[PDB]
């Protein structure tokens, strides 16, 4: 675990592990931990960015989400867990099915699976379709991966701050009492 | 041996009494740890209790008699003339939480391997000085002043003076423990501290519940109070 | 000498160990009275018919039906097809295949010493292969299908119920779906 | 050793799933004595059930208690309904035969089979003795096999009559 | 004898084989491997079942709905005892189907525990090597692979812990069921059981 | 211990009474085990009964005079003024079942071969020390104190003082097994102990009946 990335200057310069799950973890168990950390990181960053954009007066998409049923982007209120509740169940299934296909892909396509060697959190299909990070030095890439992990840890605390606000009003300061 | 050192420390604390371990807690193997680690823990607990009791005694005199900072802050919700048990009860819930949390951060820094190693010391249960709060030389962001001796008044003090000061710390901490709980006991079992009879008012409320009553939920921040 | 399937009887000499699906199982020594190649031809014909019968019965009972066909369960499917009229049509390819592949092959098996083994029509359009393990799989699947068809018919006729062919459905195959509260009572 | 003894016949031949005599062949004689004992008791029990089905003795079981032979059911209820003095006499007779008449074990606490005897040769001088070796072996094998089938059957009847009250299960 | 080498002897019985009836001395080594495999199987089933009963009695249920019409709390609102009935038929059918698959695979692995195999070490990747069947290589035991960080001595200590905890759980699960059936049988069990 | 050792122990406990086994329990082989182990079991029984009876004497005096713990709800629930035998019957059965199981865990700890041989002693039937109780050194989890001397006193006691103390333990146990039973017999049979007439409150129940509701027939749960 000492070799793995994540130890920035913000927790000494060392691994953060009160309970010591890394001590139990073997090399492949640490690979699982990093893969799960990264997936939670990425999903949380997407979730918190979407919640902020939707609920911070951002421009909702134009047109009707569902012409047949009449549901519109504007009709979906700019409120957490209300827009999702009012989204058509078919659209919810679309999102979940695309995510499930992508995750079975990221499990079956990577050849040296994060569990058996490999690199945790590498998904070649989705990353950089325009190749934006295809000519960066290896150091720079390591620094950017460290930035990814650090941003995502904050994002996954933030998305739970949003969630616990709706389910427990006035939980988070500096956040509306409703959602 | 750790027990030999503790025995000598007891003689220094009081040579007429000397080492008085009626329960054998030094000999007991707490957590299965050896006698050295157990004595380190027990000594650290003694100085921690004594330190906190001395601060608590001075704070009892400050709060009960009336000693408040001016301006916006937790002191503006405590009713005037409130008892020392009532001041903690009357400060805001977030004030209680942040006091206890700041104390928690200090305790965490106190037992952290990071700060103790940056200061070239070890944990008190693993061959270290029992009661040593480390300098904030590993707090990511630099902190201006350290907890112990913040202005560095003791940067050149003799080891003999420091040892005598620790002997004094233990004794005064024990005595302050007794006095502070004298105050607490006089308010719930009257006529138990004879001198304090009529001085300490009765307090109906659990001392050992920190958050009961939870206290007001006021918002004392004024400029930028977007969280209200 | 002692049979593998029956460890208290001597195996017959005709079974040996070359034939696919051979488990030394012949307590009545029927291979002596009946030729082994004829018996294998009969076994494979029955196995194939029972496999087709099981899959067709299960599909028709579950709901798959040809257009214009009567929408009935497999139990009444025979009577419904006979009543509607189109069921000698299926006999016609059966009659063709039998008359022009079984009778000549049967006569070749009985009389001609140089002939293909029982059930070997050389029918492999896809060339999947007639390996020993493949023939063993054929024999095992076929025998299981024979017993399965026997049970399926005898249970569908008895209960007149859906696909499980049991009185209480899947609960009979799976006792702990019934209550379990008497099991927990005795415990 | 043990693989060729009276009982190593039938479809299974020698049958030791949990390796009892394989681990302790010295205990095979004790096990044979116990098997013969249980088998014989079960033959008696199965015949008693089957014959109590249709034939019952005449007269009163206990005239003081006014309990008649025909009044009793056929099963465990009959043994329940026998008076306490009858049960005590039954135990006394069984104990007399067990300890004195037909001694299955010689002595100490962990009883060994008698020295100059077969595993279960408990009868005295006045008993049918077969002198043909083939017939003796065949009929001893018949004894132990019928005993085994009898104990399986008798457990079946006991469980059926416990569940329902009749040894005959419905069907 | 194979009995002297196996784990399971603990400090509680004086570090001696706890066999009052002597069946371990009586039966052969093959039956002893059967008995150890069955012991560990019952113990692991019971370590699952005891905590399951605790969760049910606490009425701690997942947030959601088992079927489309019944809630996890609706099933659990009658205590653990009357729960398997309230589970929909399809759900328990699928549970028992996967349990059947696991049992058949573990028994179908060639180095059988009786016939030359480690008792209780059911293969960690069932459904692998089966002709005409593909499943993910999700390791049955420890898919996160916590075992890689433990030496053989630590594995022996944890196997001893496994056997002892299994025995305690086999007692505890029947304790819970008996506490429900007979109300006063096991004290320290409240009315939820 | 041998019967010669028992004779020496008796002659040291009371020189005049001396060895006074008139029923020959010291000679009857218990469970077929040797006399040296029957002596161990009998001596452990004597010590254990004396221990429990001394504690019971003090506890009976404490319960009859209702010196109860101040900060518990079970004691408050039990009515005041009851006879000491009834102060046991008026308790939740779940507390009785935990007192008893505490003694069970302790007497499983005591007789354990591994703990005894780790600390150095053996079982009382295996030539060990009768009336010994091993500390909780080999316990699964840590615990603060042992049972015998949870504090330190008598960690530096001479073998002479220990021998004197064991003799006094046996003698005081023999006396307390009679004093406590004098209390019980005067409670449940008035005028049985002539000197306690009008001192011990009377009682109707069975002191050999721990739980109110019969556990063997119909218990109670919490
Ligand atoms: C579920 C998300 C998740 C996961 C899988 C991990 C995983 C990891 N983190 Mg952690 N981490 C997380 C969230 C997570 N982190 C968050 C939110 C923070 C910010 C507070 C951090 C801050 C952090 C730091 C500063 C460091 C790590 C490091 C690590 C690694 C070693 C420690 C370990 O074994 O953790 C295992 C974690 C789990 C098994 C999940 C915990 C489950 C409990 C029950 C949740 C309790 C939370 C509570 C509900 C609120 C490992 C790859 C170290 C590293 O990368 O070293 C190279 C390191 O330096 N993490
Ligand atoms: C009272 C019960 C009993 C006893 C003492 C025996 C004893 C014996 N049987 Mg067994 N046997 C029994 C019941 C019993 N049998 C029953 C009911 C059947 C019918 C299935 C058989 C069928 C049978 C066959 C076909 C053969 C034997 C043989 C033997 C001998 C082999 C050594 C052995 O493993 O025995 C020791 C057995 C025991 C101590 C019984 C243990 C039972 C446990 C406690 C419970 C088992 C669970 C449940 C009831 C089933 C031995 C004399 C073999 C023999 O004679 O080889 C030379 C042999 O070939 N037996
Ligand atoms: C049904 C579960 C089960 C099974 C199969 C086993 C199997 C085993 N145990 Mg046992 N054991 C169990 C439950 C079980 N145990 C429980 C609940 C406890 C806690 C009290 C123990 C405590 C225990 C200890 C402390 C030791 C063993 C040991 C053994 C081994 C030798 C004894 C033997 O032949 O047992 C065969 C078992 C059976 C035939 C099951 C008995 C079935 C009857 C009908 C149950 C009776 C009703 C109830 C009281 C064997 C692997 C010894 C060992 O590990 O040696 C290396 C050993 O020292 N066990
Ligand atoms: C109508 C239903 C049906 C059908 C069409 C088949 C078809 C088949 N079974 Mg059978 N089988 C059935 C019902 C059926 N089974 C039932 C109800 C059971 C009881 C559980 C079995 C149990 C069974 C076993 C145990 C085995 C077969 C096998 C086979 C295959 C033999 C040829 C082969 O290896 O091809 C080449 C192989 C393939 C194309 C891969 C398998 C394709 C699917 C998943 C099957 C074949 C695909 C054998 C086999 O090889 O299966 C893999 C085999 O071992 N079957
Ligand atoms: C998502 C993330 C996945 C995480 C994976 C982790 C994971 O699942 O790990 C699974 C796992 C693991 C692991 C490790 O790999 C780890 C993590 C790391 C590695 O170093 C070590 C190993 C081991 C490889 C273990 C699991 C063990 C279990 C389940 C044990 C369960 C055990 C239940 C019991 C004993 C129940 C007992 C009931 C009792 C005693 C009942 C009772 C009573 C009372 C009611 C109390 C009171 C009553 O009293 C009276 C009557 O008076 C008496 C009695 C007897 O009636
Ligand atoms: C004077 C004292 C005599 C005592 C001995 C005695 O009289 O021996 C007599 C004797 C042999 C002999 C000898 C003689 C030559 C005749 C007499 C000589 O004697 C002397 C003294 O010289 C020598 C001797 C003893 O060698 C033979 C005794 C034979 C006996 C008594 C044999 C029972 C088998 C039962 C079985 C297998 C049950 C299966 C039972 C089964 C499988 C079931 O329960 C099945 C079932 O029920 C279920 C569960 C439910 C139902 O719905 C359905 C059915 C019914 C299917
Ligand atoms: C939270 C909230 O609401 O808070 C409220 C309540 C609270 C906190 C009570 C408040 C307050 C009161 C506060 C904070 C008052 C602060 C007062 C203050 C700070 C008063 C300093 C006087 C210094 C003097 C006269 C120094 C002379 C010094 C001299 C003569 C020199 O300069 C000498 C010398 O240096 C030279 C020139 C340079 C060298 O050549 C030589 C030396 C070195 C010798 C506020 C503001 O209301 C806010
Ligand atoms: C009727 C008639 O005519 O007569 C009689 C009948 C009857 C009923 C018998 C009567 C009575 C009353 C009797 C005889 C009552 C007897 C009661 C009895 C005999 C009660 C012992 C308790 C001992 C305890 C708790 C000891 C703890 C001792 C402990 C825990 C120790 O610390 C031991 C110690 O060794 C260590 C470990 C360390 C050393 O440093 C030394 C010490 C000592 C500290 C009457 C009423 O009088 C009248
Ligand atoms: C409630 C119960 C109880 C009572 C009322 C009681 C009363 C008396 C009296 C009466 C006036 C005397 C004078 C006395 C003396 C000694 N007791 Mg004792 N005792 C009780 C309990 C235990 C336990 C649990 C242990 C123990 C022991 C010893 C030893 C150590 C000897 C040695 O270490 O050689 C000595 C000298 C320990 C042991 O080992 O005894 C062999 C031990 O484990 N006692 N004890
Ligand atoms: C000196 C000393 C010590 C000490 C000490 C003590 C008692 C220290 C106490 C420190 C304490 C109590 C420090 C509070 C800080 C509060 C902050 C930063 C709040 C920011 C708030 C912010 C940034 C809010 C911003 C906003 O609402 C704004 C304004 C409007 C918007 O535009 C944006 C938002 C909504 C976000 C040691 C080290 C312990 C020992 C040593 O020996 C001596
Ligand atoms: C059904 C049901 C229930 C149930 C049930 C249960 C658990 C039923 C269990 C029934 C069970 C367990 C029935 C075994 C029979 C075994 C037989 C007949 C074996 C004979 C075997 C014999 C006679 C062997 C003879 C031989 O040894 C001889 C003599 C010599 C050897 O040479 C040859 C062999 C080895 C062959 C509920 C739950 C109560 C309610 C529910 O609603 C309905």
UniProtKB/TrEMBL annotation, chain A:
Entries under Pfam families matching the protein: Chloroa_b-bind
Binding annotation for chlorophyll b: 42
Single biological process term from Gene Ontology: photosynthesis, light harvesting
InterPro entries, alphabetized: Chloro_AB-bd_pln, Chloroa_b-bind
Keywords annotated in UniProt: Chlorophyll, Chloroplast, Chromophore, Photosynthesis, Plastid
Keyword match RNA-binding: no
A single MF term (Gene Ontology): chlorophyll binding
Annotated chlorophyll a binding sites: 22, 37, 40, 148, 151, 153
Organism domain of life: Eukaryota
Compartment(s) of residence: Plastid, Chloroplast
UniProt name for this protein: Light harvesting protein
GO cellular component labels: chloroplast; membrane
Main localization category: plastid
Automatic annotation (TrEMBL), chain B:
GO biological process terms held by the UniProt record: photosynthesis, light harvesting
Binding annotation for chlorophyll a 1: 20, 46, 49, 94, 169, 172, 174
Residues the entry annotates as binding chlorophyll b: 51
InterPro entries per UniProt: Chloro_AB-bd_pln, Chloroa_b-bind
Subcellular localization(s) per the UniProt record: Plastid, Chloroplast
Annotated positions binding chlorophyll a 2: 45, 48, 107
Gene Ontology cellular-component annotations: chloroplast; membrane
Protein's UniProt keywords contain Chloroplast: yes
TM segment ranges: none
Main localization, broad class: plastid
Keywords: Chlorophyll, Chloroplast, Chromophore, Photosynthesis, Plastid
Name of a matching Pfam family: Chloroa_b-bind
Keyword Cell inner membrane among UniProt keywords: no
GO MF annotation, one: chlorophyll binding
Domain of life: Eukaryota
Name of this chain's protein: Light harvesting protein
UniProtKB/TrEMBL annotation, chain D:
Positions bound to chlorophyll a 1: 15, 21, 35, 38, 143, 146, 148
Residues that hold chlorophyll a according to the record: 15, 21, 32, 35, 148
Chief place where the protein resides: plastid
Annotated localization: Plastid, Chloroplast
Keyword Membrane set for record: no
UniProt keywords, alphabetically: Chlorophyll, Chloroplast, Chromophore, Photosynthesis, Plastid
Residues where chlorophyll b binds: 40
Record protein name field: Light harvesting protein
Gene (name only): Lhcf26_1
From-to range in the entire protein, with total length: 32 to 202 of 204
UniProtKB/TrEMBL annotation, chain F:
Localization, UniProt: Plastid, Chloroplast
One GO term describing the cellular component: chloroplast
Binding-site positions, chlorophyll b: 26, 51
Binding residue positions for chlorophyll a 2: 48, 107
Annotated GO MF terms: chlorophyll binding
Pfam families: Chloroa_b-bind
Positions contributing to chlorophyll a 3 binding: 69
Residues the entry annotates as binding chlorophyll a 1: 20, 46, 49, 169, 172, 174
A biological-process GO annotation: photosynthesis, light harvesting
Keyword terms: Chlorophyll, Chloroplast, Chromophore, Photosynthesis, Plastid
InterPro entries (alphabetical): Chloro_AB-bd_pln, Chloroa_b-bind
Protein name: Light harvesting protein
């Amino acid at each position: 675990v000492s070799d793995m990335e994540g130890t920035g200057p913000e927790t000494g310069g060392k691994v953060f592990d009160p309970m010591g799950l890394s001590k139990i973890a073997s090399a492949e168990t640490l690979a699982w931990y990093r893969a799960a950390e990264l997936k939670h990181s990425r999903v949380a960053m997407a979730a918190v960015t979407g919640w902020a954009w939707v609920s911070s007066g951002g421009p909702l998409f134009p047109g009707y989400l569902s012409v047949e049923q009449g549901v519109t982007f504007e009709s979906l209120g700019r409120d957490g867990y209300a827009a999702w509740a009012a989204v058509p169940e078919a659209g919810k299934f679309q999102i979940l099915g695309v995510i499930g296909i992508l995750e079975i892909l990221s499990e079956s396509a990577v050849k040296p699976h994060y569990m058996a060697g490999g690199t945790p959190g590498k998904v070649p299909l989705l990353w950089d379709p325009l190749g934006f990070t295809a000519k960066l030095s290896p150091e720079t890439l390591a620094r950017k991966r460290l930035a990814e992990l650090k941003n995502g840890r904050l994002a996954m605390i933030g998305v739970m701050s949003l969630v616990s606000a709706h389910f427990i009003p006035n939980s988070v300061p500096l956040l509306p009492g409703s959602v | 041996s750790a027990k030999a050192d503790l025995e000598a420390f007891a003689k220094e604390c009081n040579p007429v009494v000397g080492y008085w371990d009626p329960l054998g807690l030094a000999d007991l193997p707490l957590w299965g740890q050896d006698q050295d680690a157990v004595i380190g823990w027990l000594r650290h607990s003694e100085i921690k209790h004594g330190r906190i009791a001395m601060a608590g005694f001075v704070g009892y005199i400050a709060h009960a008699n009336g000693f408040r900072f001016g301006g916006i802050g937790p002191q503006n919700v405590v009713p005037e003339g409130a008892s020392a048990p009532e001041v903690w009860d009357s400060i805001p819930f977030l004030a209680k939480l942040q006091i206890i949390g700041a104390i928690g951060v200090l305790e965490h820094i106190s037992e952290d391997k990071n700060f103790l190693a940056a200061d070239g010391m070890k944990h008190y249960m693993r061959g270290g000085k029992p009661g040593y709060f480390p300098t904030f030389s590993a707090n990511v962001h630099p902190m201006p002043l350290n907890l112990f001796d913040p202005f560095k008044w003791s940067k050149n003090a003799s080891p003999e003076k420091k040892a005598k000061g620790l002997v004094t710390e233990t004794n005064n901490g024990r005595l302050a423990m007794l006095g502070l709980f004298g105050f607490l006991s006089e308010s719930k079992i009257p006529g138990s501290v004879p001198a304090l009879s009529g001085i300490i008012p009765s307090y109906d409320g659990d001392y050992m519940q920190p958050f009961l009553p939870t206290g007001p939920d006021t918002s004392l921040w004024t400029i930028g109070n977007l969280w209200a | 000498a002692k049979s593998k399937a029956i460890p208290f009887l001597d195996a017959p000499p005709a079974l040996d160990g070359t034939m696919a699906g051979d488990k030394g199982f012949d307590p009545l020594l029927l291979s002596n009275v009946v030729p082994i190649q004829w018996a294998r031809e009969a076994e494979l014909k029955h196995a194939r018919i029972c496999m087709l019968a099981v899959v067709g019965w299960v599909t028709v009972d579950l709901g798959f039906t040809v257009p214009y066909a009567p929408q009935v369960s497999s139990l009444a499917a025979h009577d419904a097809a006979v009543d509607k009229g189109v069921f000698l049509g299926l006999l016609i390819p059966i009659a063709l295949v039998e008359v022009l592949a079984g009778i000549p092959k049967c006569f070749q098996i009985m009389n001609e010493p140089d002939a293909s083994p029982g059930g070997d029509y050389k029918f492999d359009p896809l060339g999947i292969g007639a390996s020993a393990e493949m023939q063993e799989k054929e024999i095992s699947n076929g025998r299981l299908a024979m017993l399965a068809f026997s049970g399926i018919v005898t249970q569908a006729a008895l209960t007149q119920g859906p696909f499980p062919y049991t009185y209480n459905g899947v609960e009979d195959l799976v006792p702990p779906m019934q209550s379990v509260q008497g099991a927990l009572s005795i415990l | 050793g043990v693989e060729t003894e009276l009982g190593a016949t039938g479809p299974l031949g020698y049958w030791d799933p949990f390796g009892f005599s394989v681990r302790n062949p010295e205990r095979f004689n004790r096990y044979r004595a116990v098997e013969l004992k249980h088998g014989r008791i079960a033959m008696a029990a199965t015949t008693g059930y089957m014959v109590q089905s249709f034939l019952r003795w005449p007269g009163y079981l206990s005239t003081s208690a006014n309990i008649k032979f025909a009044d009793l059911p056929n099963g465990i209820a009959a043994f329940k309904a026998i008076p306490p003095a009858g049960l005590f006499q039954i135990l006394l007779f069984i104990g007399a035969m067990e300890a004195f008449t037909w001694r299955y074990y010689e002595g100490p606490w962990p009883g060994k089979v008698p020295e100059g005897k077969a595993p279960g040769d408990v009868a005295g001088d006045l008993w049918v003795r077969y002198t043909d070796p083939e017939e003796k072996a065949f009929k001893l094998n018949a004894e132990i096999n019928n005993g085994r089938a009898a104990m399986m059957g008798s457990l079946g009847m006991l469980m059926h009559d416990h569940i329902l009250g009749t040894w005959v299960p419905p069907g | 004898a194979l009995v002297d080498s196996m784990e399971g002897v603990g400090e509680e019985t004086g570090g001696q084989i706890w066999d009052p009836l002597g069946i371990s001395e009586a039966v052969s080594d093959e039956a002893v491997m059967w008995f150890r495999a069955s012991e560990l199987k019952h113990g692991r089933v019971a370590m699952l079942a005891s905590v399951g009963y605790l969760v049910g009695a606490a009425k701690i249920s997942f947030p959601g709905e088992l079927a489309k019409g019944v809630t996890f709390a609706s099933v659990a609102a009658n205590g653990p005892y009357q729960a398997w009935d309230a589970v929909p038929q399809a759900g328990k059918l699928q549970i028992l189907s996967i349990i059947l698959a696991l049992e058949w695979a573990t028994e179908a692995k060639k180095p059988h525990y009786m016939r030359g195999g480690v008792p209780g070490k059911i293969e960690q990747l069932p459904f692998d090597g089966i002709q005409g069947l593909w499943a993910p290589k999700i390791k049955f035991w420890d898919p996160l692979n916590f075992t890689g960080a433990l030496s053989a001595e630590q594995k022996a200590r944890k196997r001893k812990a496994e056997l002892k905890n299994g025995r305690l759980a086999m007692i505890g699960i029947i304790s819970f069921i008996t506490g429900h059936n007979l109300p006063g049988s096991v004290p320290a069990l409240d009315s939820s059981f | 211990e041998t019967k010669a050792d028992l004779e020496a122990l008796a002659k040291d406990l009371n020189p005049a009474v001396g060895f006074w086994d008139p029923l020959a329990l010291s000679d009857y082989s218990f469970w077929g085990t040797s006399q040296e182990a029957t002596i161990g079991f009998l001596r452990e029984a004597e010590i254990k009964h004396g221990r429990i009876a001394m504690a019971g004497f003090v506890g009976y005096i404490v319960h009859s005079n209702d010196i109860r713990w101040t900060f518990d709800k079970v004691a408050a629930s039990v009515p005041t003024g009851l006879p000491a035998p009834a102060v046991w019957d008026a308790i939740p059965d779940i507390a009785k079942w935990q007192i008893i199981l505490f003694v069970g865990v302790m007497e499983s700890w005591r007789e354990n071969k591994v703990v005894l041989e780790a600390e150095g002693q053996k079982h009382y039937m295996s030539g060990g020390k009768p009336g010994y109780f091993p500390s909780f050194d080999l316990l699964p989890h840590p615990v603060p104190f042992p049972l015998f001397d949870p504090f330190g006193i008598s960690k530096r006691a001479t073998e002479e003082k220990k021998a004197k103390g064991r003799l006094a333990e046996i003698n005081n146990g023999r006396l307390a097994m009679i004093g406590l039973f004098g209390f019980l017999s005067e409670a449940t049979v008035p005028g049985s102990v002539p000197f306690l007439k009008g001192v011990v409150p009377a009682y109707t129940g069975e002191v050999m009946a721990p739980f109110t509701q019969n556990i063997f027939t119909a218990p109670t749960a919490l």
